[PDB]
Amino acid sequence: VAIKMVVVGNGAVGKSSMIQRYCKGIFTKDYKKTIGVDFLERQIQVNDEDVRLMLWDTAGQEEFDAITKAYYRGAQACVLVFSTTDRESFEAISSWREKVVAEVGDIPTALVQNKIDLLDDSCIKNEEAEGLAKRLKLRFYRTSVKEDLNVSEVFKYLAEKHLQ
């Protein structure tokens, strides 16, 4: 069981960091993270199935309005990411959802609030984040890529939803 997954959202929310954390077990201090290939990979056991997850990176092209059709094509699951400290990233989420739906239709999707380790400087109230999850009817995670909190859980959930 091989699965292509996309991770989308505004720039600097921590998308590349999330993929690096899940597939390599690392977190670096750089202001911007880079992946040198189309996707990183992790092989896991899910309900007696050997599953191979392939997580595709946007290559920073969201800041230049230039994400290609090839990025989205074939996707079987999706992570929508916004940042705790970035008001604009939260407001953009429903539009990112439409971009994916337009390309591949309905696929298992999770909503993610990253950088929860910086909660004292939060630009989004809990009720606001929950209100969005309810409206889009999506599983919602409070995540810290930095502290490795609720990263692995997201991809496991999505893998299980693909199989059932």
Has 13 been labeled as part of a binding site?
A: yes
Is 144 annotated among the ligand-binding residues?
A: yes
94 burial class (0-12, 13-18, 19+ CB within 10 angstroms)? exposed
36 carries a ligand binding annotation: no
Select from 8-16, 22-30, 80-88, 142-150 the region that touches Mg ion (CB under 5 A).
Answer: 8-16
> How many residues are given for the chain?
164
Q: How far is the CB of 146 from Mg ion (least distance, A)?
A: 15
Token duo for residue 16: 């590349």
Six token digits for residue 91: 């407001």
The rounded distance, in Å, linking the Cα atoms of 110 and 140 is 6
User: Measuring CA to CA, which residue among 41, 30, 40, 32 is closest to residue 13?
Assistant: 32
Q: Which does 51 bind (CB under 5 to 8 A by kind): ligand GDP, Mg ion, none?
A: none
Task: Give min distance, CB of 86 to Mg ion, in A.
Answer: 14
126-136 vs 93-104: helix axis angle to the nearest 10?
20
Q: Is residue 121 annotated as involved in ligand binding?
A: no
Does 144 contact Mg ion by CB under 5 A? Answer: no
Range 116-145, binding ligand GDP (CB under 6 A): 117-118, 144-145
Annotated binding site for GDP: 12, 14-17, 30, 33, 114-115, 117, 145-146
Interface contacts to Mg ion, rule CB under 5 A: 15-16
